[model samples]
Target: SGFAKMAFPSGKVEGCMVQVTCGTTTLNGLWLDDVVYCPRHVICTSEDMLNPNYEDLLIRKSNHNFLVQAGNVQLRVIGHSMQNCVLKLKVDTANPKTPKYKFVRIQPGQTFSVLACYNGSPSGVYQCAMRPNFTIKGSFLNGSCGSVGFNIDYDCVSFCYMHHMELPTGVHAGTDLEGNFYGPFVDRQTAQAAGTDTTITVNVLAWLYAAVINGDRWFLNRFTTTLNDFNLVAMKYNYEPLTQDHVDILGPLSAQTGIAVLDMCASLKELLQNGMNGRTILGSALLEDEFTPFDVVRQC
Candidate 1:
């Protein structure tokens, strides 16, 4: 599910244990007493919208910055409805060979569409919108509209998801569980048919993985204070804390691969146990690592 399921247990909408489910996995997270913990990393800056400030302790973009998954993502607006939906976000075409903001209309297909509508009380699923890598500053970025703010569920890992690349599948890739897509090539050739790789695909995935590993340690380490604080608050309210399982289930091969750094403090051993082995396996990593850009991706 590309949406956040936040429960309002305290009556007020302060926040409940933040829950984001990537594929079949659901990771429970929390935010600062002020910020809401958004799985897949959270950012406060919009492409040209909400640039984060130094004093802020939460909204860091180091662990995100890239999306390895594809398809539409869910957007959440608060205190307002469709009446105030400003459906537009900048797309970062990572392929700097073209214009900085040239929206890709073909090849990989039409980019993000203008979406996001209100369903009375403020909750709805949007469509493929913005660049594979986009940003949201919140409140629909319209303060005058009585906008309280907004939240979105996108792919994340080491950076706050400022940059991301989607396969031809987009966000709708793994929709069919009983089909090849559910597990990509691991399941069957059909899935591989669409998500296979090439030099550029691996090149992008490589940058994403390295970028995450280098900074995952940095971000995970630096955010220790907030993690501890978030846990305490979540527990005080009987909410759940962030765990390794969450990191293990992130979408995007790069996002999952990028989380390898968390193996140090986030249940490294338990991640591979049981029947839940996905990525993070040493064999695959070695295959990709040995040759440099040995990444297997979706080129279809």
Candidate 2:
């Protein structure tokens, strides 16, 4: 028996469930064993959608480790509707004497300590690049310095020359002081290497920076969310310049529950800007909307 040829060319099945394949599959139920037809739309395979050679996007030299040390990177990728994208990579060190780095990641809209390791002093030069995982193409920009020139100490007398020592490219100096780190500084040129201790300052700094950028009260929650007796004390002293006003909106936030450190910084920055230089006297009650940490040395 012949099968019914019901055709609706204009109105086709659509959305996630297009019952029919983009191309034709023989109606095995019937005797039409060799039917050949074009599929209106086909669900593309992972390979078809994201071919390895399909290097549509490119993240150029987003960073370099001089003047700015670690966080100095310049990146630009070309593509459209990019999602589930990530770059995973490692490093090769030329000198074991001086510590090298391990590879790291650059999060979406957030640049932190993106490290790359050059573990040993191999006569062969050290190199670094992007390691786009299965999600993206595994294309990495190369950078290396051979043993002959790898040693910055081998030819250094001035501090300026010292700046080039197997430097930690994606990190900063002051951040290390507070046990925080930042970077993923993709190397564009060859240079020595160094280890990084930058743990997670970028996220913190980002919140503080956001407060200034957005000027939204909720942004302060980043700091306030991390309040404690110790944190409050440190803030009150370090931010003493900001804590004088009775305007401390969230009084004794140390007594308050968990809050992000960002909120604390926000409150302090606001109080300080208003001439609250620890000279203003605090009344019995404080502003309900405003908050101040406990360690804040009142009157001190």
Best by lDDT: 1
Tens-digit per-residue lDDT, 1-300, candidate 1: 111112112212122223332233222222222222222212222331123232242222222332211113332322111111111112222211221121122212112221111211223222221211222212121111111121222321111111111222433221110111122312111222333222222222233344354333221222223345444443443223444433342235434554442332223212212222444332233112111122222211
Superposing all C-alpha atoms, what RMSD in Å does each candidate have to the true structure? 22.7, 26.0
TM-score of each: 0.17, 0.17
Tens-digit lDDT track for model 2 on 208-285? 233333333332423342334434543543422222232243333322323333455555445434443443222211
Task: Report the Cα lDDT for residue 46, model 2.
Answer: 29
The number of residue pairs in model 1 that clash at the backbone is: 28
Relative to the true structure, how large is the alpha-carbon lDDT of every model? 0.24, 0.21
